[PDB]
Each structure stands twice: as C-alpha cells, then as structure tokens.
Design a protein around this nucleic acid. Structure first.
Ligand SMILES: [Ca+2]
Length: 185
DNA sequence: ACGA
C-alpha cells in the first residue's frame, strides 16, 4: 500500500530560510505533478546559471521561452491533492538532499499559506537519497550530486524527479537502508 | 561538499 513520491524543487537560490520555490515537481510511478511558480523574491544569478530560469518582469522564463506559472496557494494545494488522491497508496516522499534543502523550504512556504498541517496529514515521512547514496556507496564514490549520479549510473525539476526515481530503481535500496535515511515531516 |  506504500508508494514512493520522488520530489524536487527549483528555487530562487540556496538560502533555505528565504528562497522562494520556482518549480515543484513529483513523480510516483507513472503519475507526474509539476508546476512553475512566479517567485516573490529575486532569482540569484547562481540559480539562473544552474536552472536557466529567470524573470522578465512578471514573466517566468526558461531560457528564451516563457513558462506558465500557477499562484502559490493553488500550486501547493495541487501538490497536496496529488499526494491525497493520485498515488494509489500511502505516499512517502523521496528527495535528494531533502532533509537539509527541499523539506525546510517547502515546510516554510506551506506554512506561509496555511497548508502545512493539511500537508502533514497526507504524508508523514521523507527519504533522503543524498545521505542514502553516501551510505550505499561509502568509500566507493567520491561525488554524490544528482547530475554526477545520473551520468554515472544511467536543472529541470520534471526531468530531475524522473532520473531520481530511475536512480533509486537501479540502486534497489533495501527497506533497512531506506529506513536509515527516513525522517519525519 | 549538497541543494538553487
Ligand atoms: Ca533538487
């Protein structure tokens, strides 16, 4: 009955206490959720360099193409509805550096919109593939960034959740290893 | 030493 939901954020930068979410994406088997958001703060140059995302006035741009955004409230509610209705089981989140990056950001933004407790009512745990991969390949790999891992074993949050799901499938982590890198939301 |  459990279902893994791989998720990923694109953001305005690296400050987890203040950055806004620019893209929220998730995949659970074949089901895909992905939305762009118009940020409420500036996208740092470093972030634009990594993602190609930037803001032209009130228009979010992926390189030279506008992308459609969804207001924050509706975007976050959509992700909750995905977790509630679309995974066909009891979801557990999975993300790369989720404990120290994605969850602190998403927790903060959810709270800004009064959605944190509804969120926590539909999902309770999260797996961190960064610390998981560092254990599985301890003394084996010298890098554990997701792009490196994808290149070795196989930044747009829709492709990135897909490749994290595939990495996880290749790695085939045992339940005991997974539990070792699971934290409570 | 990872994330944007
Ligand atoms: Ca990520």
């Amino acid at each position: 009955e459990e279902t893994l939901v791989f998720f990923d954020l694109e953001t305005t930068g690296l400050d987890t206490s203040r950055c806004d979410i620019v893209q929220l994406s998730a995949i659970s088997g074949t089901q895909v959720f992905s939305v762009y958001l118009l940020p409420r703060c500036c996208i740092t140059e470093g972030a634009s360099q990594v993602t190609g995302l930037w803001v032209d006035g009130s228009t979010l741009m992926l390189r030279e193409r506008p992308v459609q955004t969804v207001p924050h409230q509706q975007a976050l509610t959509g992700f909750i509805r995905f977790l509630q209705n679309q995974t066909f089981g009891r979801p557990i989140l999975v993300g790369h550096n989720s404990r120290r990056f994605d969850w602190p950001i998403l927790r903060r933004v959810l709270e800004e919109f009064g959605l944190l407790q509804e969120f926590r009512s539909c999902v309770s745990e999260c797996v961190d593939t960064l610390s998981l991969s560092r254990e599985m390949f301890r003394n084996a790999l010298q890098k554990f960034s997701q792009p490196f891992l994808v290149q070795h074993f196989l930044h747009d949050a829709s492709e990135d959740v897909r490749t994290l799901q595939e990495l996880y499938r290749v790695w085939r982590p045992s339940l005991e290893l997974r539990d070792n890198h699971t934290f409570r939301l």
